[PDB]
Amino acid sequence: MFSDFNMYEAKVFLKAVADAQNTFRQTAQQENQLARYESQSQSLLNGSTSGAISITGDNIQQGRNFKALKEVKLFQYSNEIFKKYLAGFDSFSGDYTAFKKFLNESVKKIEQDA
Amino acid sequence: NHSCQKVFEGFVSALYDTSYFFRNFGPFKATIHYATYANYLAQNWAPRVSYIETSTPAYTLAKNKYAVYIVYGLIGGALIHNYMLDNKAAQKSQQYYLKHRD
Amino acid sequence: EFYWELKTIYLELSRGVATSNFHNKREVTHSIIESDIKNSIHKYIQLIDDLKDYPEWQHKVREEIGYYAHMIYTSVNHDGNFPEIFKEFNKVDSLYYFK
Amino acid sequence: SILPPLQYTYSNEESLELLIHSIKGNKDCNSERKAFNLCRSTVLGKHVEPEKCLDKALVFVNCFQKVRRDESAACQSAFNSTLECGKKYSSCQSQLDAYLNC
Amino acid sequence: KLDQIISYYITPVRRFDKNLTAEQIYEQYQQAAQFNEIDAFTNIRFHRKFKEYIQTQEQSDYLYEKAKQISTLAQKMFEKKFP
Amino acid sequence: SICLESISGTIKGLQKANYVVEHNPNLTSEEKKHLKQFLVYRYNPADPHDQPKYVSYWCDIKKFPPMFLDAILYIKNELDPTLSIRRSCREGICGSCAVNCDGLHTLACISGFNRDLSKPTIITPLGHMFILKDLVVDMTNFYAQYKMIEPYLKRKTPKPDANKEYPQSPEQRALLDGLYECVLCAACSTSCPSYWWHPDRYLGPAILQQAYRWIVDSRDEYTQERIERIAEDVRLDDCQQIGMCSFTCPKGLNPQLSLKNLMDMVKDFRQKRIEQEVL
Amino acid sequence: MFKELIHIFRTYFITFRYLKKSNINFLKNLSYTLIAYYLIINFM
Amino acid sequence: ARLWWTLDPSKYYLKQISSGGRNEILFTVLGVTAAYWYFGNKRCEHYWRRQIDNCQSWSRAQNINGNNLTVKQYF
Amino acid sequence: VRLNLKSNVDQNEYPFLAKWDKDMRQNYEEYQNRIDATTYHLQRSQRGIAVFGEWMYPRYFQKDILELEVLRRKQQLGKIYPEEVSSYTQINPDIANDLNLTFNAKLLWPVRGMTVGAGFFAFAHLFNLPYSFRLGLFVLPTAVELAFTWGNKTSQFKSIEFMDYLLQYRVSKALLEKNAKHFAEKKAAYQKEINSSQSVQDLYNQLITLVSEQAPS
Amino acid sequence: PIRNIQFARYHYLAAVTVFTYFATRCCLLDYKKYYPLASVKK
């Protein structure tokens, strides 16, 4: 055990450290959310302008140019990347350590292919 | 009072009639009688630890001379087992989480 | 139930005469209370008469229920319609409580 | 089921070391902690503008990292002795004070 | 009691490295919350896979960091692939 | 109907009479004060315009024997004949002249009026009892209380002699001594706090002492029956050993001690109902 | 304490005499049940 | 009286059954058995709780009308 | 801790944020004093011995943890505007009633209890009864209303949830004002080319799901 | 002959004490009144 004053000081220091980590995370999340919102707005405007997506109030339907959509291209590229790199993904039934090893191998392979 | 004394008397008569009807209606009356018997059994025959040992010790059953000790031992064993189980569960949860933290 | 009605009547009579009853102090009883007391006295007389076949039961009833009647009678002055209210009680049952 | 659940699981040794380092930091970098608390006390720096208090938070975090390092040989020895005493606890105030004076 | 309260308070602290610095910790927190375009398609699969592998905050953080790094690499590849 | 008016009158009437707690009417008009002052409670509930009207009378103390009853008679024979009082023995033996003599419930016959001409003396009825006339209380509730106690010798079995006196040693007759001297003055009962709260449900100190005397009779074989009849509800449980019964007893009795004995018997009877009833 | 409180109520409060002993016995049982329930709830 | 506070059990409530003493061993056994099920659930729930935030535990809120919960900038 | 009453906000570009800062600075001192009192009480209880402390704590110190949390939440959000409460009524009605019974914003008399008591007085004047009995009956419904009103501790949880929602809404709104000038250029073109009142956050979720559903891949 | 009269007396006294402790919170007091009249640490 220790003194109650020392316990209070340690609690204050730990709370301060936690608050600093929360502030760092909040700043990172705010910057990322602002960037993501700008990118989403730009993508929606480009899609609507190109005649690829028709927005109707709250529902959106594929348009005539839906094949040239950047979102469709991104989905196809993500599928290709997952197939070529994350072969065992959604099917790797190993433990937490096995999954971590597979993820590390996939990340290393992606960096090698980068 | 006044002509409203008729209203007061009528209200009294209506309340008395309602009380009599609710009391003397077969199903509710049987249920109330059963509930009264159950309440008498619960209150008058409550599980007290102390009771009249009127009979002589040569006729006293050993279950009564050991009832207090048995009850106290059961309560103490339950408390100790609960504390031990809580400590063991906390330690096992800590260990399992540390293994799973990896 | 009869004894409780008599006791409630007695408690109503005593309630307006208590020293702590500053809420309402009426010297003369209301006509409702007098009529209720008269009806209760008639009922008590009839019930006591019906208890003639059992002398012990009749004596017990006169001792128990009649005590409240004597208490009420002593709590009310014998003026005006008081004899009209106490006509039934003040025949034999009055002397039982030395009245 | 009323106490708050634990989010990040640390071992007993890690908790004792973190407590000792937090005591050392509160006894050493209290100025940095106060600066961080004051910068993170207003509504703006608390929720609206988190980027403003970034410098003070970084200073406090660097101070905490240096304190928990215990690079000095005397500090390391004192921390090891205090950790041994705390583990023996499964008292120690003198060892804690000796570690603090280092 | 006091030790239990201290442990409960310390439970919310992320266990970073002792030798690591404030700048490195902040960069790692920034890398975790990294803005990527192709992540939207990768995030769904990553979360679906990690839903059965997340029981502790530390494991969740590790898996999320790995997923975020992979997503950033994939976003860089996508940016290099389609001008 | 008359509820609001009654409430207003009772609130105001009590408010308008709180300051004037003593009307203190004067019998006549006088200036020189060579006579003692007596405030006699006058309450004639026969005419509608009549209420407690305690009158201040002045008369020479030496004009009559220094007795409360004698002074009351002198005032009621010469000054104010309208006053009424019950008194027959005039020797403190019948309990008839029990009155509130200077803040105490005592028989007026065996009493002494104050000789301090400066200090006026106030005499009123028995207290918490229906007042039939000025200083005349009605013991109708008390008298019925004597009927409930069954104050008669009850024999479960007869004596074999059939021609002589019941065998009673002097000590056994002494067990009833000091309880048979009660004059039934109802002074102890009138000052009993238990009867002041529950006059109907409580027999009273005098009734309890009479019941104890009847139960403790050597010849009577209904002591258990007397205990059973007494140990019902708050008939005896109302008494809380306050002690005003013995201090207000003009006969020198110990109603508090009699009540203590009766309560001890009742409590032992409850134990005897369990100790002596098992098989 | 319950019997003493009941006696005190029946002594000072004249209005307390309007309730019969059957209700008082139900009142005492209800008070005992409430006390037991409160004792259990404070520990549960 | 003037002193009624006693520590003895109630003479009316100190009764005993015709089959022996008061039914206490069975009642105590039932109480202990019920406690095991009762104070086995809170122990399981309290000691097996983990706090995890993964950006998916949050879900788009909806009003009591079921529509997506959105508040205008100027209310 | 001792935040200055004077806020350095511009008050000419982000008025909502300026008002929020002014409100936070206004009520910071009293809230801090109350929080300090509660924390001192908690520390003293922790310093207790056996049944008087350190044994039933913080389990028996339940009313103090919630009070401290509520005080902290009230310190974080300066002043609650009545207009914003009604928006929270979209999720939970009677939020204003819960806040009034929890934050002591105004006087809380037993209105329904007073009406019930006056109702019994009408019967008291019809079937003639003592005025003391009439007053007792009038107090009894009022007393029941007061008892049912005070002590509402779940209302404190509801108010905590409302305060958290309001804090989140204010944080989001303040962020909108800061980037309003920057996002002004995109807003006009987005409104011109996208006839949609729903948020783009859910709209993007629709487009992503549609692409994952029906796309040439 | 009341069996375990000491046990009954102890149970009654303990029940009274527990009822007083739980209903009045005498052992768990609030020191916020003396909080202003205190010396702050740190």
Add this chain to the structure above:
Amino acid sequence: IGTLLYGANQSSKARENKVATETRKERMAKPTIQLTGADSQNPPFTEKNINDWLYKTVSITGRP
């Protein structure tokens, strides 16, 4: 009474079957998902993920 209870259970089962048929039709209304090469080599169909592809049309290559 037993027959009435069985009939009520059967009616509830019929309603549930109708709901499930509507859900399955909606799921099958999606276009076919190709599974060739590695997609066929390591199909995403998993026991924990089976609920994510029930009545979902795929076109997988393989050797029977």
